Design a protein around this nucleic acid. Structure first.
Lengths: 235, 50, 49, 186, 126, 88, 94, 80
RNA sequence: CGCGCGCUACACUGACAGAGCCAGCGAGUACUCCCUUGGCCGAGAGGCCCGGGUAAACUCUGUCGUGCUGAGGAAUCCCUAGUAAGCGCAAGUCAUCAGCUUGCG
């Protein structure tokens, strides 16, 4: 697959969107040809983008840890003041989440409060039934994996902050048992060269990491906007 | 003492709502008459069913 | 029609009538399942018309 | 033994710790000023008189506690000092801006005794420490007078000393016999 | 071979097992200490049997309590009943009956509900 | 809807033969006018209640200035007796 | 000590209300109310689950701070709450 | 007999953009008094201008007062 | 249109942020809140993907301070111990009951 087709298609698509003011996400729709069965392939992943997805001007992260919440809150009070303490408004363990936040109004207030979410890989299995469907199933604001894994068994704190810096702007990947998925690459206010770079590295990482029996199982990637038509890419 | 003026309607009756805006008063009157007619229709239909 | 919420016996049934006037006409009627379960229309439901 | 001392500056007092020397609590309930932040010999209760004339007495714990016990608004003109009695726990004194010093008791809503006789601002005063000097009060004014009163007879001053300068500070000596009046350049 | 006494305690729906063995003097409720498990004002309800009997009686025993059910108040009353009945039953079995009778007399003179749970039946004025 | 006075209901109460002198709201009106214009009300040391024959007990705020005319006063008193309050 | 904090182990000597206030020297000034103001059996906190409303004059035996607490929980929104009332009594006595 | 009362005149009514009445309350409770300004909005204004929440209104210099009157005109020029 | 019976709103018994800690009844291969803008694979009917509309309470610690941000008249009725009152959780049993009913703590 050559990226010149992606560049001409995404330029035509931005012209199609235009002809604040845009503020629409652009994604590519993955199709595969065989059903997906492995529950370890059904795990949500992240793809680190070369141009990060988030603006990081005023957005607030929420960080969901597992075992002692006081240890992780003291690490947040310890480590890094420039980028991290302005963003990390809450550190919630999964026990405190399942305790305090079971109500529809409470999880609606949390979803309206915070801007983007991060969780640990031992918790995102638990999270679609801890956090509500109005948090999880509806929109893109849903937790991204951050590997806080080696008194809690935790990775060392500079690697923790490096992982959170990598994972704030990363692109979330959900897989589904069906054969069609879609994955966001950016917005419509961006430049199409950056868009085509994001689509290229997402194609590389999506196939060669997540879709099993990789380029055998691949089907068409159709670049799409919110309400527009889809443009081909590797039929 | 800073005295104040008692707000009251001169020709008072309990049988009439008081509202400045005729649009809002008329919309509330139409909603009340629609509820009354719907309840009367449901009562007549239920007695005919029994 | 189609069931909407199903309790032990009383089920709420959705895609059959259009208004509470029509339900009040067909109050007490012998409703039936495809399976063979008999039943009776009891009361119109307020919030979904 | 305790680890509390209070410094008032502007519209708030700030109870400091002795060991840590940090501002342990900052109390800014006052409307306008706070002219002496004086805590009781028990060490749980702070009195402070404002610039609007009220004095507020409020409990502080070891931590962040500012629960208001009583408020008096009888002076109606500023109160510059308000001091606890060194022996009794509920008796306190007040030198206000007008002409008056006066004795209060904490349960009552009335000043228990009133002492007049000064002709200018009275702004410094203390009780007299001693076994024999149970109820004597000294206060100096801005009228260049130090007066010491018996609290048993609320007439005039028992003794009066006239200086040459506006009298800024007063302290008795712990033997109870002698007294230092700080007035001007001497 | 080991000296061990298991005693139950009861309130509305809050029940407490207290196992009392020969020990150094600790009291644990749900694996946490007795000075931790309660609301902050009902710890004086928990410390009632210890302060009645004195600490010299509890110097030799180790009590482990589990509680389930009820609310905070019912669980606190169940814990204090399990504590009092537990030390009385240990002194029944493993030291003298005169000490058992002295402990029972002091606890009954303070409050009978430390030993005998009185359920609230329904019998109003018939 | 108007208060029961001796102005226009003199025929009704004289026909039904029950104490034409009793139904007088003008006493309450002139006395409440007196008390609201008095300087002890303007200083603020006056508090005024009305008890009617029906058992109705009305507190009148000192901060009110009543209608000085009996027609507006009767309409205001009817609205008070039916809505249990008069907002400013 | 079994498990006791320092304030309780300090005032381990006698029965003290809220672990701070003694019942030793308390004199009821009126002769008529010595029967009905019950300070004879001391209590630690007023929260005592006692059936003091079974029959007549049984409320003449419950301690007077429990009466003060149970009458503090008196309006429409303070009805069930007893820890609020014993906390109000503790703060008021301090 | 000469101590500087350069700060003791602070409990007076200050004037601002729209309201002519803004006395001493605090620094964030004084911002609520201006119409259209909220209780959660007033804390965002103070963290940009390096003014402390501990101070009152009237404890600010003639430079520090006007810094909150520019930033109340344009909330977009300072990032939000 | 009238009448009550429930439900809701109406501020010191306050709001915000934290920390900690408590139930009982409940398991029929059975349960799902709508309807839609687009696109995938669909000769056609559909299935997908992405958008739009185990408690409450309680306890402890801090941050701010009465600010359309106002607890119900005459009457009339009911109520004496786990009773009045507050609170949530669950079920929906051939009659009644989802605008709610009945349990349970």
């Amino acid at each position: 697959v050559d990226p010149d087709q992606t560049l001409k298609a995404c330029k035509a698509l931005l012209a199609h969107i235009k002809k604040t003011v845009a503020e629409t996400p652009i994604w590519l729709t993955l199709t595969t040809k065989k059903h997906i069965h492995d529950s370890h392939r059904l795990q949500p992943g992240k793809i680190i983008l070369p141009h990060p997805l988030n603006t990081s001007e005023e957005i607030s992260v929420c960080l969901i840890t597992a075992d002692p919440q006081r240890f992780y809150k003291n690490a947040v009070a310890d480590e890094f003041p420039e980028d991290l303490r302005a963003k990390i408004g809450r550190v919630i363990d999964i026990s405190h989440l399942k305790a305090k936040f079971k109500a529809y109004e409470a999880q609606r207030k949390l979803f309206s409060e915070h801007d983007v979410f991060l969780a640990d890989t031992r918790i995102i299995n638990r999270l679609p039934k801890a956090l509500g469907k109005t948090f999880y199933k509806t929109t893109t604001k849903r937790p991204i994996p951050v590997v806080l894994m080696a008194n809690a068994n935790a990775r060392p704190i500079p690697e923790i902050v490096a992982e959170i810096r990598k994972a704030i702007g990363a692109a979330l990947v959900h897989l589904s048992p069906s054969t069609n998925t879609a994955i966001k690459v950016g917005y419509a206010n961006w430049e199409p060269e950056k868009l085509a770079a994001n689509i290229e590295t997402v194609i590389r990482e999506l196939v060669e990491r997540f879709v099993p029996q990789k380029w055998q199982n691949v089907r068409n990637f159709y670049v799409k906007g919110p309400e527009t038509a889809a443009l081909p890419i590797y039929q | 003492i800073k005295t104040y003026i008692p707000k009251f309607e001169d020709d008072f009756d309990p049988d009439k709502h008081y509202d400045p805006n005729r649009e809002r008063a008329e919309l509330a009157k139409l909603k009340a008459e629609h509820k009354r007619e719907r309840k009367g229709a449901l009562r007549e239909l239920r007695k005919d069913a029994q | 029609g189609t069931p909407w919420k199903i309790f032990k016996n009383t089920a709420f049934i959705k895609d059959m009538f259009n208004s509470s006037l029509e339900i009040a006409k067909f109050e007490g009627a012998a409703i039936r399942t495809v399976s063979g379960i008999r039943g009776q229309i009891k009361r119109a439901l307020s919030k979904p018309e | 033994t305790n680890d509390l001392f209070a410094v008032t500056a502007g519209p708030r007092v700030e109870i400091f710790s002795i060991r840590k020397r940090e501002p342990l609590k900052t109390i800014g309930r006052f409307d306008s000023e706070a002219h002496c932040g004086e805590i009781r010999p028990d060490g749980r209760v702070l009195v402070a008189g404002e610039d609007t004339g009220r004095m507020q007495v409020f409990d502080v714990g070891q931590g962040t506690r500012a629960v208001i016990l009583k408020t008096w608004h009888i002076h109606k003109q500023p109160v510059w000092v308000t001091k606890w009695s060194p022996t009794e726990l509920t008796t306190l004194m007040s030198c206000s801006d007008d002409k008056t010093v006066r004795l209060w008791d904490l349960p009552s809503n009335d000043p228990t005794r009133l002492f007049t006789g000064h002709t200018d601002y009275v702004r410094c005063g203390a009780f007299m420490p001693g076994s024999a000097n149970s109820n004597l009060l000294v206060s100096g004014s801005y009228d260049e007078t130090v007066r010491v009163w018996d609290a048993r007879a609320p007439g005039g001053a028992v003794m009066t000393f006239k200086h040459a300068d506006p009298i800024e500070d007063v302290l008795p000596l712990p033997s109870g016999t002698t007294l230092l009046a700080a007035s001007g350049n001497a | 071979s080991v000296q061990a006494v298991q005693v139950f305690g009861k309130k509305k729906n809050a029940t407490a097992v207290a196992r009392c063995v020969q020990g150094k003097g600790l009291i644990k409720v749900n694996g946490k200490p007795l000075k931790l498990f309660a609301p902050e004002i009902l710890r004086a309800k928990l410390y009632e049997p210890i302060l009645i009997l004195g600490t010299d009686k509890f110097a030799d025993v180790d009590i482990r309590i589990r509680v389930a059910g009820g609310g905070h108040t019912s669980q606190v009353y169940a814990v204090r009943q399990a504590i009092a009945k537990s030390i009385v039953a240990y002194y029944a079995k493993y030291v003298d009956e005169h000490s058992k009778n002295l402990l029972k007399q002091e606890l009954i003179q303070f409050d009978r509900s430390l030993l005998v749970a009185d359920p609230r039946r329904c019998e109003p004025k018939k | 809807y108007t208060l029961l006075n001796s102005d226009e209901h003199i025929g009704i109460m004289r026909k039904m033969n029950r104490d034409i002198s009793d139904a007088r709201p003008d006493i309450t009106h002139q006395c409440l006018l007196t008390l609201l214009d008095s300087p002890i009300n303007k200083a603020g040391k006056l508090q005024i209640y009305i008890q009617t024959a029906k058992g109705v007990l009305i507190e009148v705020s000192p901060t009110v200035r009543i209608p000085r005319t009996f027609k507006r006063f009767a309409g205001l008193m009817v609205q008070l007796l039916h809505r249990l309050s008069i907002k400013g | 000590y079994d498990v006791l904090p320092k304030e309780v182990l300090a005032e381990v000597g006698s029965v003290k209300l809220f672990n701070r206030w003694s019942y030793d020297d308390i004199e009821i000034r009126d002769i008529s109310l010595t029967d009905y103001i019950q300070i004879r059996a001391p209590v630690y906190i007023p929260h005592s689950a006692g059936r003091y409303a079974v029959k007549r004059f049984r409320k003449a035996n419950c301690p007077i701070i429990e009466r003060l607490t149970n009458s503090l929980m008196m309006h429409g929104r303070n009805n069930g709450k007893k820890l609020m009332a014993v906390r109000i009594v503790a703060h008021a006595f301090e | 007999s000469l101590v500087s009362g350069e700060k003791t005149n602070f409990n007076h009514i200050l004037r601002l953009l729209n309201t002519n009445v803004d006395g001493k309350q605090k620094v964030v409770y004084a911002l609520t008094q201006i119409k259209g300004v909220g209780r959660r909005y007033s804390n965002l204004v103070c963290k940009k201008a390096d003014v402390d929440l501990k101070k009152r209104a009237g404890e600010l210099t003639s430079e520090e007062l006007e810094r909150l009157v520019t930033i109340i005109q344009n909330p977009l020029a300072y990032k939000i």
